Amino acid sequence: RKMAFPSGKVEGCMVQVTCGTTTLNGLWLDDVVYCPRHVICTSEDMLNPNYEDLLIRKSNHNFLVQAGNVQLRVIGHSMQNCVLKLKVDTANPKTPKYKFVRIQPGQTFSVLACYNGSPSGVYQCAMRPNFTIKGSFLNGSCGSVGFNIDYDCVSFCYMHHMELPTGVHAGTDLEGNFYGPFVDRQTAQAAGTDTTITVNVLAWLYAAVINGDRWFLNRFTTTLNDFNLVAMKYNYEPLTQDHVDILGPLSAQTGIAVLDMCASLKELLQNGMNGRTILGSALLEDEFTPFDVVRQC
Amino acid sequence: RKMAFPSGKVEGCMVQVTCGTTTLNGLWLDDVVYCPRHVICTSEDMLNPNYEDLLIRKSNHNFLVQAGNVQLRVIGHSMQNCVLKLKVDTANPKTPKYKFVRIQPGQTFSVLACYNGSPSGVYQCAMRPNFTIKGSFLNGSCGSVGFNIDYDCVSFCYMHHMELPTGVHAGTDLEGNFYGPFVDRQTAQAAGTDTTITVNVLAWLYAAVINGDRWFLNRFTTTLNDFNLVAMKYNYEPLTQDHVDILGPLSAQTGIAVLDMCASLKELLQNGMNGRTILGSALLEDEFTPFDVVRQCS
Ligand SMILES: *[C@@H](O)[C@H](C[C@@H]1CCNC1=O)NC(=O)[C@H](CC(C)C)NC(=O)OCc1ccc(F)cc1
Numbered sequence: 057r058k059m060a061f062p063s064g065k066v067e068g069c070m071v072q073v074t075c076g077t078t079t080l081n082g083l084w085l086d087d088v089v090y091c092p093r094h095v096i097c098t099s100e101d102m103l104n105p106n107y108e109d110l111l112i113r114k115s116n117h118n119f120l121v122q123a124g125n126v127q128l129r130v131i132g133h134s135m136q137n138c139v140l141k142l143k144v145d146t147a148n149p150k151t152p153k154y155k156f157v158r159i160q161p162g163q164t165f166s167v168l169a170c171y172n173g174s175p176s177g178v179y180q181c182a183m184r185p186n187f188t189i190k191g192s193f194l195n196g197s198c199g200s201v202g203f204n205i206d207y208d209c210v211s212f213c214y215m216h217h218m219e220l221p222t223g224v225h226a227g228t229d230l231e232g233n234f235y236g237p238f239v240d241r242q243t244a245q246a247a248g249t250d251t252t253i254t255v256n257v258l259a260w261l262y263a264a265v266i267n268g269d270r271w272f273l274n275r276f277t278t279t280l281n282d283f284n285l286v287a288m289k290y291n292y293e294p295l296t297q298d299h300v301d302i303l304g305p306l307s308a309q310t311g312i313a314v315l316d317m318c319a320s321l322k323e324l325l326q327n328g329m330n331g332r333t334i335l336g337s338a339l340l341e342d343e344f345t346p347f348d349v350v351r352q353c
Numbered sequence: 354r355k356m357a358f359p360s361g362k363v364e365g366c367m368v369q370v371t372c373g374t375t376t377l378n379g380l381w382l383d384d385v386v387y388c389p390r391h392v393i394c395t396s397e398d399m400l401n402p403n404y405e406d407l408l409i410r411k412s413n414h415n416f417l418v419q420a421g422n423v424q425l426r427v428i429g430h431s432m433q434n435c436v437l438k439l440k441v442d443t444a445n446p447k448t449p450k451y452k453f454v455r456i457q458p459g460q461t462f463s464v465l466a467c468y469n470g471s472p473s474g475v476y477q478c479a480m481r482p483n484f485t486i487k488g489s490f491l492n493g494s495c496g497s498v499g500f501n502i503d504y505d506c507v508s509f510c511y512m513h514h515m516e517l518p519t520g521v522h523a524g525t526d527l528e529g530n531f532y533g534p535f536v537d538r539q540t541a542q543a544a545g546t547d548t549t550i551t552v553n554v555l556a557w558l559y560a561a562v563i564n565g566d567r568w569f570l571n572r573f574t575t576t577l578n579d580f581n582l583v584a585m586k587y588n589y590e591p592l593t594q595d596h597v598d599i600l601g602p603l604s605a606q607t608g609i610a611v612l613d614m615c616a617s618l619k620e621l622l623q624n625g626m627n628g629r630t631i632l633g634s635a636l637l638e639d640e641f642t643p644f645d646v647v648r649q650c651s
């Protein structure tokens with residue numbers, strides 16, 4: 057199943073940020089609160105916001121930051137790309153060991169969806185090849201963050217900013233740079249054509265085998281380049297030699313050569329699933345990485 | 354999508370409990386630690402244990418309870434059904450508001466999977482009609498708990514004890530009473546044939562309607578009894594009065610009476626999808642409860 061990281065270390069950092077009649081979430085680390093800069097916009101601003109111009113016209117006291125029942129006093133602010141950094145007069149004692157990372161398409165992360173500074177749910181997402189994410193975000197979710205946890209260190213990789221007309225989601229890293237060609241303005245934006253994350257589909261097929269499910273296997277094989285020709289035809293991402301190497305552990309554990317699983321996936325792409333299902337799904341799942349599969353197995 | 358509750362309030366309650374070399378997880382609330390009673394078993398005792406006899410040989414000082422590397426001194430112990438309650442000399446300062454609840458089949462909950470008292474991941478589970486769950490549990494996961502969070506309050510509903518031959522999982526409520534006919538012995542045990550969670554399929558159809566996907570709404574209705582008799586022929590659960598009631602909010606939100614939706618579902622069962630989809634799927638989903646549908650749509 058899709059397993060998220062335990063969210064407690066991130067919950068202790070969520071706060072509420074209000075400017076005017078706009079409220080969203082902020083991430084409170086040490087004495088800084090990070091949040092989406094469009095909190096400073098009104099309606100007459102969202103269509104074409106000149107953020108530097110809007111920001112210079114704001115005072116520290118226009119920002120209401122609430123951590124539970126407590127107001128944190130903003131004593132300074134600055135903007136880094138699409139993120140606002142509010143300096144507050146109080147250190148968060150719950151700040152975890154952390155770093156800010158920019159993730160690559162195909163990598164996964166956990167999302168802590170929050171509303172009014174309060175955590176609501178946690179779930180696992182992948183950065184799509186077209187740099188959207190298929191999230192579950194509603195009004196007021198902006199400033200919710202995505203993260204991974206290694207040992208006790210939280211690597212923040214995503215802050216939420218918007219929902220596209222197709223229902224997928226877009227946002228930034230914690231330096232405020234969008235993933236993808238998107239802009240924080242209230243305009244309908246389309247993404248590039250999405251593709252399926254092939255290395256993840258293969259990891260998920262190896263997972264279905266580990267759990268004693270192998271109806272889709274076959275006795276055939278393929279070269280890497282011939283597989284990639286078929287993959288690209290079906291709008292799957294190409295498989296690199298690093299992907300093959302990354303899949304080694306799963307190949308060893310199951311005794312199925314990577315290119316043999318590529319031949320299985322080729323058959324599935326060309327034949328369909330013919331009503332059958334894999335690990336419960338009627339569709340090929342591509343939001344489990346090799347590491348995700350390995351860890352959980 | 355399956356969305357778990359934020360796990361932090363439960364992370365703050367996880368500890369490890371060791372007897373000899375047998376280690377599993379425990380739940381520390383106020384000054385009591387709750388854990389599976391088979392921690393007192395040697396791997397060879399698990400084949401068929403006499404729990405009462407094993408416990409009589411135990412004393413407080415035989416239990417190693419640790420929050421991380423910090424030992425919690427045990428000052429009393431008792432067995433309640435299949436759980437051990439270890440009184441400790443420190444009240445957990447991170448104890449949330451909580452209650453212990455026994456859930457019904459079809460209800461969902463979040464599982465915080467733990468190993469050696471350390472949380473590894475959180476995911477949403479549904480209690481199947483045969484009283485198993487499709488967990489992702491490895492050796493050392495026993496004592497991991499399932500829960501829901503309402504307002505300030507953590508409702509603990511599941512504690513993990515065992516894996517069945519088919520790979521599904523079985524466990525107890527926090528009073529130590531197993532869900533289903535299972536016992537905590539290392540013997541071969543089988544789950545009843547499973548069935549589809551009708552109330553959750555209906556919730557899913559309501560969610561489809563809320564999203565404007567409503568081709569399957571027909572002009573008919575049915576009685577609850579007639580629907581239950583048909584549904585069982587398709588390996589669907591019969592509905593209870595409680596199921597009808599928990600669909601109330603979604604029925605009010607859409608204006609579609611519960612029994613009309615039942616008639617729509619009956620047609621889908623009898624005639625199939627005819628190649629159509631619902632919410633972008635030809636399969637009817639049965640692991641989203643009426644509450645889950647509301648949680649996500651709002
Ligand atoms: C958080 O403030 C919010 C989250 C959105 C709301 C619903 N689901 C979400 O993920 N963000 C926005 O509302 C965002 C703000 C702008 C300034 C970046 N815009 C948005 O979500 O809508 C984009 C959009 C604009 C015009 C249009 F025609 C279609 C879509």
Ligand SMILES: *[C@@H](O)[C@H](C[C@@H]1CCNC1=O)NC(=O)[C@H](CC(C)C)NC(=O)OCc1ccc(F)cc1
Pocket residue numbers: 377391394399490491492493494495496514515516517522536537538539
């Ligand atoms: C926790 O102690 C453990 C959880 C099991 C182990 C593997 N995956 C799980 O979910 N419980 C047991 O091992 C349990 C103890 C007895 C007293 C009930 N016995 C059990 O579940 O045996 C089945 C089993 C299957 C696979 C496997 F690898 C190990 C055991």
